Amino acid sequence: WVTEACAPQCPEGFDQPPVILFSMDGFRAEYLQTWSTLLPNINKLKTCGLHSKYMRAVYPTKAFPNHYTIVTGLYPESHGIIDNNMYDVYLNKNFSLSSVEKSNPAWWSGQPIWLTAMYQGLKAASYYWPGSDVAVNGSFPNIYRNYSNSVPYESRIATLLQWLDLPKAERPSFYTIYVEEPDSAGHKSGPVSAGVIKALQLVDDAFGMLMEGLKQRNLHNCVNIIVLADHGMDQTSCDRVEYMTDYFPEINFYMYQGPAPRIRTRNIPQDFFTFNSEEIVRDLSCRKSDQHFKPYLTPDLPKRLHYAKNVRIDKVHLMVDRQWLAYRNKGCEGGTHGYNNEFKSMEAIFLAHGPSFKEKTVIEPFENIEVYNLLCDLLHIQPAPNNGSHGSLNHLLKAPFYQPSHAEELSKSACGFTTPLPKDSLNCSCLAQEEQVNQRLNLNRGEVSATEKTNLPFGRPRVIQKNKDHCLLYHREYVSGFGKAMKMPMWSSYTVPKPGDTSSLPPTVPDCLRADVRVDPSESQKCSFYLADQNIDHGFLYPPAIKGNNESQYDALITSNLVPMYKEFKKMWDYFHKVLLIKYAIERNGVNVVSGPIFDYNYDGHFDAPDEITNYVAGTDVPVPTHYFVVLTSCKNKTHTPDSCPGWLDVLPFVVPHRPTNVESCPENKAEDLWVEERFKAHIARVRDVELLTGLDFYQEKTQPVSEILQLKTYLPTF
Numbered sequence: 001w002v003t004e005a006c007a008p009q010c011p012e013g014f015d016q017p018p019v020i021l022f023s024m025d026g027f028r029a030e031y032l033q034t035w036s037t038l039l040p041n042i043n044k045l046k047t048c049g050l051h052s053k054y055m056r057a058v059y060p061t062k063a064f065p066n067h068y069t070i071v072t073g074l075y076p077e078s079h080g081i082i083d084n085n086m087y088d089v090y091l092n093k094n095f096s097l098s099s100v101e102k103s104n105p106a107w108w109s110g111q112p113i114w115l116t117a118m119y120q121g122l123k124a125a126s127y128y129w130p131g132s133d134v135a136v137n138g139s140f141p142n143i144y145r146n147y148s149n150s151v152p153y154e155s156r157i158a159t160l161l162q163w164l165d166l167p168k169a170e171r172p173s174f175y176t177i178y179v180e181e182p183d184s185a186g187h188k189s190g191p192v193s194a195g196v197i198k199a200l201q202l203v204d205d206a207f208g209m210l211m212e213g214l215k216q217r218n219l220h221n222c223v224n225i226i227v228l229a230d231h232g233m234d235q236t237s238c239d240r241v242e243y244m245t246d247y248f249p250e251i252n253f254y255m256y257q258g259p260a261p262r263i264r265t266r267n268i269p270q271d272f273f274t275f276n277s278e279e280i281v282r283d284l285s286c287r288k289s290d291q292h293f294k295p296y297l298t299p300d301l302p303k304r305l306h307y308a309k310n311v312r313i314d315k316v317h318l319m320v321d322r323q324w325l326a327y328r329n330k331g332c333e334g335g336t337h338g339y340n341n342e343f344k345s346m347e348a349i350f351l352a353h354g355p356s357f358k359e360k361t362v363i364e365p366f367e368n369i370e371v372y373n374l375l376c377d378l379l380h381i382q383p384a385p386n387n388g389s390h391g392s393l394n395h396l397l398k399a400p401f402y403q404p405s406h407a408e409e410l411s412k413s414a415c416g417f418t419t420p421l422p423k424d425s426l427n428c429s430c431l432a433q434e435e436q437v438n439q440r441l442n443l444n445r446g447e448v449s450a451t452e453k454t455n456l457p458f459g460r461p462r463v464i465q466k467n468k469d470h471c472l473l474y475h476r477e478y479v480s481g482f483g484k485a486m487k488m489p490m491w492s493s494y495t496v497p498k499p500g501d502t503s504s505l506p507p508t509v510p511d512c513l514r515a516d517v518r519v520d521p522s523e524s525q526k527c528s529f530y531l532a533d534q535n536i537d538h539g540f541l542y543p544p545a546i547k548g549n550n551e552s553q554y555d556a557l558i559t560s561n562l563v564p565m566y567k568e569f570k571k572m573w574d575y576f577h578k579v580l581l582i583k584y585a586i587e588r589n590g591v592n593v594v595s596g597p598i599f600d601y602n603y604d605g606h607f608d609a610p611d612e613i614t615n616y617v618a619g620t621d622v623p624v625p626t627h628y629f630v631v632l633t634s635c636k637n638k639t640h641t642p643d644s645c646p647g648w649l650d651v652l653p654f655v656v657p658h659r660p661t662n663v664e665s666c667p668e669n670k671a672e673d674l675w676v677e678e679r680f681k682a683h684i685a686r687v688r689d690v691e692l693l694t695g696l697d698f699y700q701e702k703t704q705p706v707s708e709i710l711q712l713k714t715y716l717p718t719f
Ligand SMILES: Nc1ncnc2c1ncn2[C@@H]1O[C@H](COP(=O)(O)NP(=O)(O)OP(=O)(O)O)[C@@H](O)[C@H]1O
Pocket: 025, 062, 063, 064, 084, 097, 102, 128, 129, 130, 131, 132, 133, 147, 149, 178, 180, 183, 187, 258, 336, 337, 338
């Protein structure tokens, strides 16, 4: 097989292609992009078959959360396995690799692929996998095997080939195989060592034994083999470790030491809920200028990670930088994993071979949460509710099983111009003159279609929320979707064109703010609402001084486009729309911005119901957003503008947390140009992430297949 050339070639007896999920622990993308030629069998698979540049892991980048994420399609917070070592309050038990509690079905949530196959009339066998040796939802896989890390790989492969020798009735359709290397060698020496090469050569022979075995069984060109990894590897040193003793006078708390630290109380389960978690982050927030970590609360963490809604995730969490560790006391060598999944060193591998997959194709990077949807499509089975976008991975397959469709709108738009005179002043006034700008808001059929072409190129974001009373408001420079109930816009779409050298930019008009004649005063936001609240003040979603002359910016300064913002948050919001937005408009040759509020007080990752919202503006029914999104959209080819682009798009979304203090960025000593960009970049999320938090599906009028649009939806930009 290793000497053979690139080729369904399935023989009689086998009617459907079998799926094998090969896992090589700690096999980073760096290993495949540098040492691939040293691996004869793996190099023959990357050339003939299909492979990605890298496969994005899930935080924390460890075996048990990632392996179980691949088989379920759920985030660690949803499937329960948030860490290899964790504690449950309600069950009052400790989960550990050495403990017997690993076999307890109460820890394991969701439905893995092997069970999904069994519930749909397909047998599933497994030779090692975190969860396969556990009775998830009562049932066990058809051929499960109790874990033993010291078993030789040749015997593991031999028994898997023996399962394929079984007759059609007893013969399983789905398989999984786990390998400890090149992870064990990564901890022993490091990611750039001779030790990992020997382990990489050892996994190559192990994969070689499977392909050579399948060759004599005439299944090497029939089997849909998927060789992937859980995480990557990063070098560590005893000099590159942050000690907690240098931050606290006395340690009276339990900490999960390593790349993903979690602070918990010792007295459990009584003092768990009453433990002052917000105190620890406050005592760790920018204590040193050369600090190698950042303390975070569960909802304060970047939304893209999806690591908050689970009782096992301790409220106080630590975000350690690249190559650096965190320990409780003074009492390391080689390498480790558990860091941010966005990091280059934590990028896993993905390689596939078979008749279902496209031959000699190098696909773009994707998240492990999507593997479950692909596995279901390969086995011809309906998936269980997972967090992966079904249909996103159709570009990998020659013949896609699931054809995705656009998200159905559950709420119809129904605001209209009648007279330019306002019924109620709403305690707001502009010093400037007669009401001439009020008639400019009133646009004819042609003028509406003009702004629905320039500022709305991919169409209006459809409301996926049930009974959401909303109205569409049109302006010459921006189109917005006002939310009648929350008295603020859900979204605001506007295409900023490519500007000149622009050394001096026009400033925003101060003290000028009028009332909207289209929106009814009962559903309108009053300026007196922010008068009583000293902490929160009126902020505009769409910046007025971004398009046109001094007269044109009068449309934004109205009761509409007004959203509640903190005085400290405005420093991040205004600087981004005055310096950064223009800077990235030059690089992309114009940019389409879709911005709005996010309500996620229950930190589940989904949009909040009116009852779910806990904080409102002082003595008013207008809510306060938890986060604010900014979706920047352009094109892959820089020659075209977002208003008129034929081809593939380029996206840069954000989920900026709406916090009363900039304690996350730490603005002390640093000028706005040194921390605003850094925070936005740290809070970059997928288009699917903004969609789930708002209940607004984007890009529905874009002339491209639903499968191709989902690739942009799942896309996460990495710098
Ligand atoms: N199904 C399983 N059941 C129990 N233990 C397993 C199973 N699969 C793998 N393991 C064990 O989990 C290890 C991989 O876990 P990890 O890579 O997540 N953690 P490790 O390398 O020990 O170091 P840390 O950075 O977490 O300190 C393997 O080497 C096995 O010993």
